Amino acid sequence: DRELAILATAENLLEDRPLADISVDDLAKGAGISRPTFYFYFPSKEAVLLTLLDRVVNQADMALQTLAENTDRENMWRTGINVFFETFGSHKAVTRAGQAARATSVEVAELWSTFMQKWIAYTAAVIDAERDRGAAPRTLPAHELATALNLMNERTLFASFAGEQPSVPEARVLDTLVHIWVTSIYGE
Amino acid sequence: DRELAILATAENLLEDRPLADISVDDLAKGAGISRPTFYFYFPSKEAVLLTLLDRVVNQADMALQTLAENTDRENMWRTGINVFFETFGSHKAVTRAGQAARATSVEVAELWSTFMQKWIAYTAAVIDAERDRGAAPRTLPAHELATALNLMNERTLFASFAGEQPSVPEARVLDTLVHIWVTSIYGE
Numbered sequence: 622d623r624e625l626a627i628l629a630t631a632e633n634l635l636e637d638r639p640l641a642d643i644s645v646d647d648l649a650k651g652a653g654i655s656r657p658t659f660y661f662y663f664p665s666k667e668a669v670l671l672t673l674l675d676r677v678v679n680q681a682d683m684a685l686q687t688l689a690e691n692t693d694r695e696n697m698w699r700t701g702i703n704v705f706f707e708t709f710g711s712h713k714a715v716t717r718a719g720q721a722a723r724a725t726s727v728e729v730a731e732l733w734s735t736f737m738q739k740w741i742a743y744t745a746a747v748i749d750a751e752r753d754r755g756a757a758p759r760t761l762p763a764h765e766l767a768t769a770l771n772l773m774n775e776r777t778l779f780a781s782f783a784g785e786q787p788s789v790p791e792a793r794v795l796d797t798l799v800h801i802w803v804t805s806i807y808g809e
Numbered sequence: 810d811r812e813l814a815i816l817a818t819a820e821n822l823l824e825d826r827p828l829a830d831i832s833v834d835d836l837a838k839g840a841g842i843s844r845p846t847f848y849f850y851f852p853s854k855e856a857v858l859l860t861l862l863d864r865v866v867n868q869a870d871m872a873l874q875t876l877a878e879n880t881d882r883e884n885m886w887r888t889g890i891n892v893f894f895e896t897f898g899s900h901k902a903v904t905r906a907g908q909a910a911r912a913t914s915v916e917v918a919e920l921w922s923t924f925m926q927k928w929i930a931y932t933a934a935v936i937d938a939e940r941d942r943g944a945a946p947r948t949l950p951a952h953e954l955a956t957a958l959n960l961m962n963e964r965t966l967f968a969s970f971a972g973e974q975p976s977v978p979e980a981r982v983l984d985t986l987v988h989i990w991v992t993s994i995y996g997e
């Protein structure tokens with residue numbers, strides 16, 4: 622509860638500054654607590670980002686699970702990719718911080734890797750279902766095609782939300798990715 | 810010349826250790842020079858990685874220029890993506906280091922961004938040429954389609970070469986990307 626306040630403070634601060642320019646004293650102060658009381662909840666600011674990413678990742682995973690318990694094929698994929706556009710799009714600071722943190726934090730890398738393996742495995746299953754039903758041609762190995770498409774979405778989403786040059790404009794991202802997914806899944 | 814030796818030492822060391830676990834004393838020693846003589850050539854180890862990435866990036870850019878001064882459409886794109894698979898594939902350590910460095914080094918980010926804008930702009934031009942000749946349908950904005958495909962290759966190449974979980978196996982990468990590029994460029 623003082624915990625949530627640390628979390629909300631970190632999320633707020635990461636909007637304007639990297640994690641490197643946020644001190645533990647910054648988190649404690651925004652949360653209305655002392656520095657030692659902070660250390661009772663988190664051993665470090667990295668530990669804060671980790672929890673924030675865990676929440677975001679689980680939120681996208683739960684929304685995708687919701688979707689999976691149920692339009693034409695283009696709209697089907699668009700709704701799925703939209704889960705990630707919206708969830709990560711709603712937590713750009715955290716998303717952006719956690720991506721950069723993969724390169725330093727072994728635990729951030731593991732968290733991200735676990736969830737990506739999951740989303741890939743789900744994409745691959747649907748793609749195999751589409752093949753099984755005769756909707757999609759048996760072209761590339763489904764799991765490798767799934768891997769490349771999910772890596773694309775990851776990089777494209779995060780570049781767009783960060784305003785990186787180069788990037789697809791946020792308002793064009795969803796159409797761009799959907800076109801690529803549908804053509805590479807259903808085409809030959 | 811003592812310069813090249815620093816560069817070759819860094820490249821060698823980065824094979825087994827991140828840049829964080831390589832000290833300036835490590836670079837000087839492998840190069841057969843003292844620590845102050847090192848500082849004459851580079852103000853920092855980051856400056857070393859920057860130069861190494863510059864070389865790799867320019868090498869892929871020059872190979873792509875070579876290719877551009879000249880098979881069917883699938884083989885055309887496969888040869889282009891192969892330029893990057895092979896060039897980055899031949900410098901995995903540096904490539905891997907420089908990707909992680911984008912997140913900390915403003916200059917590494919600028920170098921990478923400049924070259925990506927260039928490769929995107931070239932992909933977009935060829936795609937527009939393909940449309941102009943009636944080989945490819947006018948679907949998405951060429952420059953946005955180009956952006957997404959090049960971001961995919963970047964992320965997929967680097968994940969594969971790093972042995973990340975998840976990744977496409979290095980021996981399947983080229984086929985995977987080619988399939989995606991050709992279907993999304995020529996399909997509807």
Ligand SMILES: N#CCC(=O)N1CCC(c2nc(-c3cccs3)no2)CC1
Pocket residue numbers: 685688689697698700701702705740741743744747771774775778
């Ligand atoms: N980043 C990231 C992951 C991502 O963009 N996706 C795109 C959507 C993929 C996906 N949708 C589905 C759907 C099933 C039914 C409706 S939709 N099954 O898999 C999950 C990963």
Ligand SMILES: N#CCC(=O)N1CCC(c2nc(-c3cccs3)no2)CC1
Pocket residue numbers: 873876877885886888889890893928929931932935959962963966
């Ligand atoms: N990473 C990264 C960049 C990359 O993979 N590509 C793929 C190849 C793209 C490309 N090939 C061509 C070709 C023209 C003629 C033969 S081929 N024009 O553009 C450049 C960027």
